[PDB]
Amino acid sequence: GYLQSYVYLPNVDKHLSAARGYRLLSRGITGIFSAPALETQGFVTACQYLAEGSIQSQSIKSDAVRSVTVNSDGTVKNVESSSQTVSSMPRYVFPLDGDNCAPS
Amino acid sequence: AVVTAAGLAWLRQYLNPMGPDTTSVTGYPDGSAVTTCIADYSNTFNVSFPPREALYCTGSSSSEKPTLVDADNYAKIDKWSNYDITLCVLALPMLRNVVMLRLYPHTPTAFALTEQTPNFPQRFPNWSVYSADGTRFNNGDEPGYLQSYVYLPNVDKHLSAARGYRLLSRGITGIFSAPALETQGFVTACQYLAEGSIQSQSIKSDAVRSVTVNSDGTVKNVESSSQTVSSMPRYVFPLDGDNCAPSSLTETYHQAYQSKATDGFYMPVLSSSRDNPFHPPQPRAIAVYGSFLARGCLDPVSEAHEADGPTHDIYRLNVADDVAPLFNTGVVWFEGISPKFSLKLKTRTVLQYIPTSGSVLANFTRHEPTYDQIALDAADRLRNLMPHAYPAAYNDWGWLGDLLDSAISMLPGVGTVYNIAKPLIKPAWNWLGNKVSDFFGNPVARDG
Amino acid sequence: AVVTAAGLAWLRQYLNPMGPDTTSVTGYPDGSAVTTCIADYSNTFNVSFPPREALYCTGSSSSEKPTLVDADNYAKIDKWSNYDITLCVLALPMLRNVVMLRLYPHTPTAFALTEQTPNFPQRFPNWSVYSADGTRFNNGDEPGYLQSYVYLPNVDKHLSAARGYRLLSRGITGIFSAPALETQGFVTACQYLAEGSIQSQSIKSDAVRSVTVNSDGTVKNVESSSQTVSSMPRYVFPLDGDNCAPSSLTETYHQAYQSKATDGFYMPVLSSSRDNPFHPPQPRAIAVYGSFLARGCLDPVSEAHEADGPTHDIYRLNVADDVAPLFNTGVVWFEGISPKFSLKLKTRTVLQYIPTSGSVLANFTRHEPTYDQIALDAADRLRNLMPHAYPAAYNDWGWLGDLLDSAISMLPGVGTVYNIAKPLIKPAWNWLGNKVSDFFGNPVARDG
């Protein structure tokens, strides 16, 4: 369906490791486009908007345990339902509107 | 250096949502430079003592079965109707479910909520019954109170088709009526910030216990899964239910409104923050913070007692919504009301949308991203001076706008051009004694 | 005695719907004193040579069966793609179905239509094929052209929930693109009033013939029911299909627009009337007048030949809509276009609604019933001077508004205050030769 890649800066990782604190001062991205002659057709659209992410955990389900102790002396029958709703591990979630990110 | 017309209009509609002059609708003056459509929802409801047909049980009776009408325990509710009653309305910053109505036989000591999640909370025309012992009601119990949610469906429809939203203003009017010789009663109203947040309560898992007594099967998995984990996230409101009794609210907040019941009420709910950014619609289950019971690590204890620390009770409302952050929570009480009453609730909620492509909202866009710093500063300045509510008939305040907004817009910084506009004095909103004076000392003769 | 701001804004948005300055939307300046909401629909489509998946047969093949994709007669359409093609766009005053696109292997002599009603006309992304002999296409025939309708669904949704409507303005932009060394081609555009009306065509009933040959049954009902009656009413457009060829349009109308294909087009369709009243939504089947064949009573004949008089052919479009009356019909041709083309169609339709109670539109009302006689008179005055189209990139005309509207607003009557604004001269819109001069003689250097 599509291809995807991440553009990674390794020096940023190295320096972020050895830092007590940080803050981004500014960031710019330039997209110099080129194509063969008679192939320059196309359009470019660009937009910015605040997607205020936060540390959230999604709601997941545990697995209920089902045991059938059919033994003559062993008839515990631990049918307890562990299938409750819990929270997954925390992640930094971005509320970017994927459904509304089409160029138009 | 001077407040613009758009900023003044926004201030007027934010401080006086149901002012008769407030016909046009204006957006937040921050110059967002985004395509927006402003939607105004005006709704009217006629609340009174419900009949038996609109009463449902919240207990385990209607657990998997749908809502069950009361099995003619309505005789107890008629006994309620013998004497005077109490009617609470609680306006949380919920977008839909604008208010929550509650009917009591007599004034409670606190705004209690049930520890167990209720069954099928009912939208306004229908009510749901809760027992007197602060528990869900099944048929054959002692009813304690009735509860319902006033729901706006168009708000839900429009919130579905929106990239972002923000509440611009919200007002609630409570026009009260009762038969002749039955106008007795009192009304109290208050606003306060209950800054909710997305939290998960601490719950326990179930340890698995197996006794493999087989000759070859002797696994004996006695592992303790009974650890402490986090439940699913919910938007929790820190509303002080134990301190929501009318007397406590009256003696705590100076701007609280008190009057005779026949005066009704008019709450222009206000924001507690300077800014008002757009947010993506994200409905969540709503809950209310309670109080903790076990002190836990509030005293020197061991690790085994860390888990049972000060874990605050969380009361699930069984209602999902997206809330307007940084907006005040309102609460009004009608105490000693004749049971044959009639409250005309009128709600006006105006909020801004960023339309989604191809959605309905995209056909009503309105592109004037105006900017007005002075209006926002004036709103922040005025937040602490406006009374929390007014009599239902008290609209179109003369002091508002040309006098109050002008007399306050030139304190902020030195953003002042006119030398002196008008001195500002402390008003005395004594509606009970008919000694009301506005912000400039002009008496307010009774217009209703 | 001076044009107001609202009238000027309406004039700007009516003459230049896609002017970049036209951000706010304003209503018709007649002071209707009715609650109205103005809806602006901006849509974008990317038309090009369709693939086989989006082609359907209009013949009797898909009569009761739904639309049938071409049974790989697409080889003939590829043969079309070998050479240059022609692309017609026809903007009738239909509210939905804003334009009708048509693809020809080569320029036709007329805008033909099929006598038989087509099967399942296709909305834009899908096309429908018609045979070369001016008939509906079944698989295994000779394709003549492709046709599609560009449909706006939100317009339909809003028209459903409206007591009345009126079209305020409509513009169509045709940004053209093609590969390098393939930019060859020409574009022609024209507008003219095709004043449709509700008419019914003359059809024949079927005479019943019974031969009761029974011994006792000898009724012999030979009665002739074959009389001439009227079909169901349809909204018929008197568009001259036989005279819609590009050359005829160019040499008939002086304000017709001609240019190189790469210039695209920009048609601000205009109204042909001074007034613009509200009308109730009333969709009807749409049809186009043809030409008659039998002269009938155009010569001295008998009653038997009265029925077959000059009955004009009516071409059913198999499309139902409500039209904007008194609005011009536009037609643009792209002749000699490289088949590997790409036309970005952008349509902007702004129209006013009277909302129905409880409908969606009622949440976006806007009450400034402004009045401006001067603006309406200026629009009537300017109707005959504006060219029918401009190059796609030619927006934000400097002469428009502060110069043209001012220089024309003081001829009407003696409604003149400023002595002399600016002399008005006849422009020369020679886009082909790059010798374009506006209404005041200022040359228009190529901005694209």
Side-chain angles (χ1 to χ4, degrees):
Chain A
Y2 58 93
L3 318 177
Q4 196 195 250
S5 73
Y6 294 89
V7 166
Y8 182 77
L9 317 175
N11 292 330
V12 173
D13 173 78
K14 299 178 179 337
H15 294 169
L16 270 169
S17 293
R20 169 187 330 238
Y22 78 92
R23 61 172 162 200
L24 181 57
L25 285 192
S26 68
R27 161 168 282 178
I29 300 131
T30 302
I32 291 128
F33 180 86
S34 148
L38 326 172
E39 286 243 65
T40 60
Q41 46 70 14
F43 294 94
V44 57
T45 285
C47 167
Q48 296 180 30
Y49 59 93
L50 173 68
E52 199 210 6
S54 46
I55 300 166
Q56 319 277 7
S57 46
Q58 63 175 340
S59 151
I60 71 191
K61 308 280 285 252
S62 292
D63 43 351
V65 298
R66 293 299 172 274
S67 47
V68 188
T69 41
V70 82
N71 216 72
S72 67
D73 43 343
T75 315
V76 178
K77 185 57 182 181
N78 193 23
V79 78
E80 88 211 356
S81 177
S82 312
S83 156
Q84 50 182 166
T85 293
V86 295
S87 291
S88 79
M89 72 151 192
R91 285 180 201 93
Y92 198 95
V93 201
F94 279 114
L96 103 97
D97 260 312
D99 310 307
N100 319 125
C101 269
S104 50
Chain B
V2 52
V3 50
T4 88
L8 207 291
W10 167 80
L11 209 59
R12 285 192 99 89
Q13 97 159 355
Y14 162 70
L15 297 174
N16 195 5
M18 311 207 201
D21 54 345
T22 59
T23 60
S24 66
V25 194
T26 154
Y28 194 69
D30 64 340
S32 284
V34 195
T35 282
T36 58
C37 46
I38 317 169
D40 165 326
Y41 309 88
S42 303
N43 289 90
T44 288
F45 310 85
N46 298 315
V47 345
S48 54
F49 210 89
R52 191 194 86 85
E53 322 322 317
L55 256 57
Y56 298 93
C57 321
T58 28
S60 70
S61 199
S62 50
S63 63
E64 78 298 302
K65 196 71 183 59
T67 87
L68 322 161
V69 152
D70 290 353
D72 210 299
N73 290 164
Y74 194 65
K76 293 126 156 182
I77 323 299
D78 289 319
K79 304 203 193 109
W80 293 10
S81 95
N82 278 330
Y83 324 99
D84 289 5
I85 56 172
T86 299
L87 166 75
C88 164
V89 0
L90 169 72
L92 283 171
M94 314 198 95
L95 251 51
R96 43 223 162 189
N97 318 286
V98 47
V99 312
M100 184 210 297
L101 305 175
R102 208 173 254 207
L103 261 182
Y104 286 98
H106 40 258
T107 320
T109 61
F111 194 88
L113 269 165
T114 86
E115 166 224 323
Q116 296 284 9
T117 320
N119 260 287
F120 295 87
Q122 299 300 316
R123 271 70 175 283
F124 154 63
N126 316 326
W127 302 67
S128 54
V129 195
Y130 295 83
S131 53
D133 45 284
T135 47
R136 305 176 296 177
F137 177 88
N138 305 272
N139 269 301
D141 295 351
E142 199 32 280
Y145 58 92
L146 318 177
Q147 196 195 250
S148 73
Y149 294 89
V150 166
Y151 182 77
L152 317 174
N154 292 330
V155 173
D156 173 78
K157 299 178 179 337
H158 294 169
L159 270 169
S160 293
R163 169 187 330 238
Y165 78 92
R166 61 172 162 200
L167 181 57
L168 285 192
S169 68
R170 161 168 282 178
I172 300 131
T173 302
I175 291 127
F176 179 86
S177 148
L181 326 172
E182 286 243 65
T183 60
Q184 45 70 14
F186 294 94
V187 57
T188 285
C190 167
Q191 296 180 30
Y192 59 93
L193 173 68
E195 199 210 6
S197 46
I198 299 166
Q199 319 277 7
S200 46
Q201 63 175 340
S202 151
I203 70 191
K204 308 280 285 252
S205 292
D206 43 351
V208 298
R209 293 299 172 274
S210 47
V211 188
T212 41
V213 82
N214 216 72
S215 67
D216 43 343
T218 316
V219 178
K220 185 57 182 181
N221 193 23
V222 78
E223 89 211 356
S224 177
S225 311
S226 156
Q227 50 182 346
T228 293
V229 295
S230 291
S231 79
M232 72 151 192
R234 285 180 201 93
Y235 198 95
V236 201
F237 279 114
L239 103 96
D240 260 312
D242 310 307
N243 319 125
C244 269
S247 50
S248 67
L249 294 174
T250 51
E251 86 211 1
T252 293
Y253 295 91
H254 296 155
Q255 314 281 8
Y257 155 83
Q258 310 177 74
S259 177
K260 274 265 120 182
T262 57
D263 275 345
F265 74 94
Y266 164 48
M267 193 169 300
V269 328
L270 303 172
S271 170
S272 81
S273 169
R274 242 297 299 281
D275 85 352
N276 193 12
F278 277 105
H279 282 137
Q282 268 212 283
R284 287 177 188 277
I286 308 298
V288 170
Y289 261 130
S291 78
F292 67 96
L293 197 272
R295 286 183 64 83
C297 25
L298 274 169
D299 314 321
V301 296
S302 63
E303 317 72 294
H305 302 353
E306 216 218 343
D308 49 65
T311 60
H312 290 74
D313 276 329
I314 277 188
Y315 301 131
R316 274 89 68 229
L317 293 193
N318 204 346
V319 170
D321 195 5
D322 35 21
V323 324
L326 316 173
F327 254 80
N328 282 355
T329 289
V331 37
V332 359
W333 295 87
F334 283 85
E335 316 140 73
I337 290 311
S338 81
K340 275 172 316 198
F341 75 107
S342 35
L343 192 91
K344 197 195 245 59
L345 258 194
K346 286 156 27 184
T347 61
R348 202 210 179 205
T349 290
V350 20
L351 40 63
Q352 213 170 0
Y353 289 126
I354 299 177
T356 287
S357 254
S359 75
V360 267
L361 303 185
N363 297 127
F364 307 117
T365 78
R366 158 209 146 291
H367 323 275
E368 42 281 55
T370 160
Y371 189 52
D372 202 329
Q373 210 36 61
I374 314 299
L376 310 180
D377 306 1
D380 168 320
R381 207 33 200 91
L382 283 208
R383 162 177 56 249
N384 265 330
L385 313 159
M386 314 315 300
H388 288 163
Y390 310 84
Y394 192 46
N395 293 333
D396 50 58
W397 324 312
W399 41 271
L400 176 279
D402 30 10
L403 288 82
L404 185 48
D405 308 5
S406 296
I408 188 43
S409 304
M410 32 45 62
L411 300 315
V414 196
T416 299
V417 184
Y418 193 27
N419 204 5
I420 275 191
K422 199 161 177 62
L424 180 58
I425 78 168
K426 295 350 297 173
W429 309 100
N430 184 316
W431 302 103
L432 271 157
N434 299 113
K435 323 215 100 73
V436 183
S437 101
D438 68 56
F439 290 85
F440 310 101
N442 310 20
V444 184
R446 194 53 263 152
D447 314 305
Chain C
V2 52
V3 50
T4 88
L8 207 291
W10 167 80
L11 209 59
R12 285 192 99 89
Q13 97 159 355
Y14 162 70
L15 297 174
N16 195 5
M18 311 207 201
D21 54 346
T22 59
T23 60
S24 66
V25 194
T26 154
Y28 194 69
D30 64 340
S32 284
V34 195
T35 282
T36 58
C37 46
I38 317 169
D40 165 326
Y41 309 88
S42 303
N43 289 89
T44 289
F45 310 85
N46 298 315
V47 344
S48 54
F49 210 89
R52 191 194 86 85
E53 322 322 316
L55 256 57
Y56 298 93
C57 321
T58 28
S60 70
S61 199
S62 50
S63 63
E64 78 298 302
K65 196 71 183 59
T67 87
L68 322 161
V69 152
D70 290 353
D72 210 298
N73 290 164
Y74 194 65
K76 293 126 156 182
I77 323 299
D78 289 319
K79 304 203 193 109
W80 293 10
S81 95
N82 278 330
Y83 324 99
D84 289 5
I85 56 172
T86 299
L87 166 75
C88 164
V89 0
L90 169 72
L92 283 171
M94 314 198 95
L95 251 51
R96 43 223 162 189
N97 318 286
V98 47
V99 312
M100 184 210 297
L101 305 175
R102 208 173 254 207
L103 261 182
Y104 286 97
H106 40 257
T107 320
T109 61
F111 194 88
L113 269 165
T114 86
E115 166 224 323
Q116 296 284 9
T117 320
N119 260 287
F120 295 87
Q122 299 300 316
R123 271 70 175 283
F124 154 63
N126 316 326
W127 302 67
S128 54
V129 195
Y130 295 83
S131 53
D133 45 284
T135 47
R136 305 176 296 177
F137 177 88
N138 305 272
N139 269 301
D141 295 351
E142 199 32 280
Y145 58 93
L146 318 177
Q147 196 195 250
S148 73
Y149 294 89
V150 166
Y151 182 77
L152 317 175
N154 292 330
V155 173
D156 173 78
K157 299 178 179 337
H158 294 169
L159 270 169
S160 293
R163 169 187 330 238
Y165 78 92
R166 61 172 162 200
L167 181 57
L168 285 192
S169 68
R170 161 168 282 178
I172 300 131
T173 302
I175 291 128
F176 180 86
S177 148
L181 326 172
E182 286 243 65
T183 60
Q184 46 70 14
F186 294 94
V187 57
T188 285
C190 167
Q191 296 180 30
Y192 59 93
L193 173 68
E195 199 210 6
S197 46
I198 299 166
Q199 319 277 7
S200 46
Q201 63 175 340
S202 151
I203 71 191
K204 308 280 285 252
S205 292
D206 43 351
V208 298
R209 293 299 172 274
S210 47
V211 188
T212 41
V213 82
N214 216 72
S215 67
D216 43 343
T218 315
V219 178
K220 185 57 182 181
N221 193 23
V222 78
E223 88 211 356
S224 177
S225 312
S226 156
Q227 50 182 166
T228 293
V229 295
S230 291
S231 79
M232 72 151 192
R234 285 180 201 93
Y235 198 95
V236 201
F237 279 114
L239 103 97
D240 260 312
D242 310 307
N243 319 125
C244 269
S247 50
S248 67
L249 294 174
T250 51
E251 86 211 1
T252 293
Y253 295 91
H254 296 155
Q255 314 281 8
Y257 156 82
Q258 310 177 73
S259 177
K260 274 265 120 183
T262 57
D263 275 345
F265 74 94
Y266 164 48
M267 193 169 300
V269 328
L270 302 172
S271 170
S272 81
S273 169
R274 242 297 299 281
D275 85 352
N276 193 12
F278 277 105
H279 282 137
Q282 268 212 283
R284 287 177 188 277
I286 308 298
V288 170
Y289 261 130
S291 78
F292 67 96
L293 197 272
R295 286 183 64 83
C297 25
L298 274 169
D299 314 321
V301 296
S302 63
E303 317 72 294
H305 302 353
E306 216 218 343
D308 49 65
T311 60
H312 290 74
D313 276 329
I314 277 188
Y315 301 131
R316 274 89 68 229
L317 293 193
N318 203 346
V319 170
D321 195 6
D322 35 21
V323 324
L326 316 173
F327 254 80
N328 282 355
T329 289
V331 37
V332 359
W333 295 87
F334 283 84
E335 316 140 73
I337 290 311
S338 81
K340 275 172 316 198
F341 75 107
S342 35
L343 192 91
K344 197 196 245 58
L345 258 194
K346 286 156 27 184
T347 60
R348 202 209 179 205
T349 290
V350 20
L351 40 63
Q352 213 170 0
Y353 289 126
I354 299 177
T356 287
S357 253
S359 75
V360 267
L361 303 185
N363 297 127
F364 307 117
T365 78
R366 158 209 146 291
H367 323 275
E368 43 281 55
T370 160
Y371 189 52
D372 202 329
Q373 210 36 61
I374 314 299
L376 310 180
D377 306 1
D380 168 320
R381 207 33 199 91
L382 283 208
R383 162 177 56 249
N384 265 329
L385 313 159
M386 314 315 300
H388 288 163
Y390 310 84
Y394 193 46
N395 293 333
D396 50 58
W397 324 312
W399 41 271
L400 176 279
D402 30 10
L403 288 82
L404 185 48
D405 307 5
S406 296
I408 188 43
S409 304
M410 32 45 62
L411 300 315
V414 196
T416 299
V417 184
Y418 193 27
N419 204 5
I420 275 191
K422 199 161 177 62
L424 180 58
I425 78 168
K426 295 350 297 173
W429 309 100
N430 184 316
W431 302 103
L432 271 157
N434 299 113
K435 323 215 100 73
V436 183
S437 101
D438 68 56
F439 290 85
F440 310 101
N442 310 20
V444 184
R446 194 53 263 152
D447 314 305

